[PDB]
Amino acid sequence: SEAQSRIQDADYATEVSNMSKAQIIQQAGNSVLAKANQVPQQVLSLLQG
Amino acid sequence: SEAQSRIQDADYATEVSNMSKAQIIQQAGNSVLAKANQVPQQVLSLLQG
Amino acid sequence: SEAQSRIQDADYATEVSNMSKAQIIQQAGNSVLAKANQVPQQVLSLLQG
Amino acid sequence: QVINTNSLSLITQNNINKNQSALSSSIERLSSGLRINSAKDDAAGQAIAN
Amino acid sequence: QVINTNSLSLITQNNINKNQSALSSSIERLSSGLRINSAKDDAAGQAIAN
Amino acid sequence: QVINTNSLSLITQNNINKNQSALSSSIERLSSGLRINSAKDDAAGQAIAN
Asked: Looking at residue E40, what DSSP letter applies?
């Protein structure tokens, strides 16, 4: 049983860190996506109309 | 028999202190892991999204 | 009578550990369910509405 | 300087998509607590565990 | 300031696994009451005790 | 760092089971007062006593 548990039973210590990893990267990329979508209207501003 | 017992039969007095020390380091590491993992989102906040 | 005891009458030493397992897994599962269902509003954050 | 024909938000979308798989896998591993949950992981580990 | 690819939590995790061995050894030592439990400890002491 | 599947409490349970046999044997020995109460012990001693 002890030997089997070494292969299954993911270490929660690294998994919580990876959870925070993925969450922060996802929301940072979401904000960067919003900022990128906020770029196009510069040509509309230059259109002066 | 008493000579044999002097090689085996770990002194409980040291082992209980080692037990408490190990538990304290374990939960201290858990708390430090949580607090350190709560750091990276400073860049997220800086991103302003 | 002892024979019948060896079939029925589950050992409590295993059952206390099984109970601890079940309770800890249930708590972790409910907490991770909350952490998972608090994710979707990132799409609302993207919309900037 | 183009109207949505060459916008750079696409690479951000792709990066978000790549990290989405990692996020889902991490949440699932937190939920189950097992390193291998399906054949997508190392199948040898699953066979040995069984 | 880097994008999460060089997080310092790794050191904390590594230290936790290092202390895990000591914790498990301590609990097992308490449970058994015998200083020697297997060949991982001083094997010469185990042979002499046998 | 895992949930009770690599639990070291199994070792404690094992040791409790090993000492349970000794405890039961001791109580039974006190109750009877004779060293050999069944053939678990030295059968030669039981035959000689008979």
From this structure: T
For residue B44, the number of C-alpha atoms closer than 13 Å in the C-beta half-sphere is: 16
Please give the radius of gyration of chain A, using alpha carbons only, rounded to the nearest integer: 22
Helix, strand or coil for residue A20? helix
Tokens of residue D26, six digits: 């991490």
Q: Please tell me the experimental approach by which this structure was elucidated.
A: cryo-EM
- Whether residue A1 and residue F1 make contact (CB cut-off 8 A), yes or no, is no
Rounded distance between C-alpha atoms, residue E49 and residue B8, angstroms: 7
Regarding chains B and E, contact by 3 or more CB pairs under 8 A is answered as: yes
User: How many angstroms is the resolution?
Assistant: 4.2
What are the CA-CA distances from residue E8 to residues A17, B26, D21, E1, E33 (Å)?
11, 18, 23, 12, 39
H or E stretch covering F7: none
DSSP string, B1-49: -HHHHTTSS--HHHHHHHHHHHHHHHHHHHHHHHHHHTSTHHHHHHH--
Q: Which helix (H) or strand (E) holds D37?
A: none
**Beta carbons of B22 and E29 less than 8 angstroms apart:** no
Partners of residue F13 in chain C, C-beta under 8 Å: 13-14, 17
